[PDB]
Design an enzyme around this catalytic site. Structure first.
Site, mmCIF file in Angstrom:
data_model
loop_
_atom_site.group_PDB
_atom_site.id
_atom_site.type_symbol
_atom_site.label_atom_id
_atom_site.label_comp_id
_atom_site.label_asym_id
_atom_site.label_seq_id
_atom_site.Cartn_x
_atom_site.Cartn_y
_atom_site.Cartn_z
ATOM 1 N N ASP A 170 0.822 -1.206 0.000
ATOM 2 C CA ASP A 170 0.000 0.000 0.000
ATOM 3 C C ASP A 170 0.861 1.263 0.000
ATOM 4 O O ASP A 170 1.359 1.679 1.056
ATOM 5 C CB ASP A 170 -0.918 -0.030 1.233
ATOM 6 C CG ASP A 170 -1.826 1.191 1.334
ATOM 7 O OD1 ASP A 170 -1.934 1.927 0.337
ATOM 8 O OD2 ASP A 170 -2.442 1.379 2.411
ATOM 9 N N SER A 220 -0.580 15.616 -12.025
ATOM 10 C CA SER A 220 -0.821 15.251 -13.405
ATOM 11 C C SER A 220 -1.069 16.518 -14.228
ATOM 12 O O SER A 220 -1.620 17.497 -13.733
ATOM 13 C CB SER A 220 -2.018 14.301 -13.488
ATOM 14 O OG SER A 220 -2.426 14.089 -14.821
#
Length: 330
Positions: free
Chosen positions: A35, A199
């Protein structure tokens, strides 16, 4: 040193991925959920409330000659999905894919919430976010990656998740045969303890690319892709019959639909998520309403590039003094 381990989807939907991890001496192999959105290595154990264990493999520290109780240490964690666990702490030897750390904090669960009990395939979590998020008290502990880092050939790990197929986590090296083209690297903020990046934009299907900054985290422990409501609405508007269902808890679409791809930007580069990766199947057994793999982050408080996005790429988690993230097509 290096390590390399195969990671395998837990079910036909790629809801999560498990990777075998050796703990203790002799080794006890548990299948852990790696994770990158948390920083605790915790396991089902011989200390876990018996009624909360249902099929998982447990770690038994009393059977490990290298286990040592970390005196006074406790831990307690709650995840973004509302699940939780807590317990006490041992140090022991932990190996992943041939890479060994001695004195790793292994957090033994005394209690786990129902979602963990109900998932027989996940024996615990192995956190790979920054150690500043580790919940051990009163002495915070380091992640497996942080402990291994100085011994690694290069201070990196990579995630290569499969679509409906096994993939690989590598530590200490970049497998240049595992991706196509070049790896594009992008800046990381560690201020929130996550692999947080920005992004450069998105496209829906064969649509034009929208240049827009989307701050989010690279999170292997989250199934879906969670993005701003504007982006998500633009995606699902291209699927006939799709709608946001308050009753179901997100966007659903007719199972008869063909889904468009979704592209996200990494610097000047582009990662394409095929439409099929965005199908999470019927909302309930036999339903013709299917659950979408791109959902709104509104009310989460952060955008999450979970498995839906990450499995479309070869992803480098660069833990150099100034961390960065790399993405390549594959």
């Amino acid at each position: 040193s290096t390590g390399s381990a195969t990671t395998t989807p837990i079910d036909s939907l790629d809801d999560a991925y498990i990777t075998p991890v050796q703990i203790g001496t002799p080794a006890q192999t548990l299948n852990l959920d790696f994770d990158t959105g948390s920083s605790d290595l915790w396991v089902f154990s011989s200390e876990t409330t018996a009624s909360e264990v249902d099929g998982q493999t447990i770690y038994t520290p009393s059977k490990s000659t290298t286990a040592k109780l970390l005196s006074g240490a406790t831990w307690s964690i709650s995840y973004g999905d509302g699940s939780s666990s807590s317990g006490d702490v041992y140090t022991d030897t932990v190996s992943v894919g041939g890479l060994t750390v001695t004195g790793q904090a292994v957090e033994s669960a005394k209690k786990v919430s129902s979602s963990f009990t109900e998932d027989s395939t996940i024996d615990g979590l192995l956190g790979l976010a920054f150690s500043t998020l580790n919940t051990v008290s009163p002495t915070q502990q380091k992640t497996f990656f942080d402990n291994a880092k100085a011994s690694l050939d290069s201070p990196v790990f990579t995630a290569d998740l499969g679509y409906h197929a096994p993939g690989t986590y590598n530590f200490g090296f970049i497998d240049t045969t595992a991706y196509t083209g070049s790896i594009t690297y992008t800046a990381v903020s560690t201020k929130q303890g996550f692999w947080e990046w920005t992004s450069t934009g998105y496209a829906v299907g064969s649509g034009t690319f929208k240049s827009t900054s989307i701050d989010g985290i690279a999170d292997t422990g989250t199934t879906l892709l969670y993005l701003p409501a504007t982006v998500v609405s633009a995606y699902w508007a291209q699927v006939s019959g799709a709608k946001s269902s308050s009753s179901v808890g997100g966007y659903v679409f007719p199972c008869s639909a063909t889904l468009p791809s979704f592209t996200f930007g990494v610097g000047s580069a582009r990662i394409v998520i095929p439409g099929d990766y965005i199908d999470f199947g019927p909302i309930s057994t036999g339903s013709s309403s299917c659950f979408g793999g791109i959902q709104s982050s509104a009310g989460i408080g952060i955008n999450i590039f979970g498995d839906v996005a990450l499995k479309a790429a070869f992803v480098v988690f660069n833990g150099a003094t100034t961390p960065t993230l790399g993405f390549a097509s594959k």
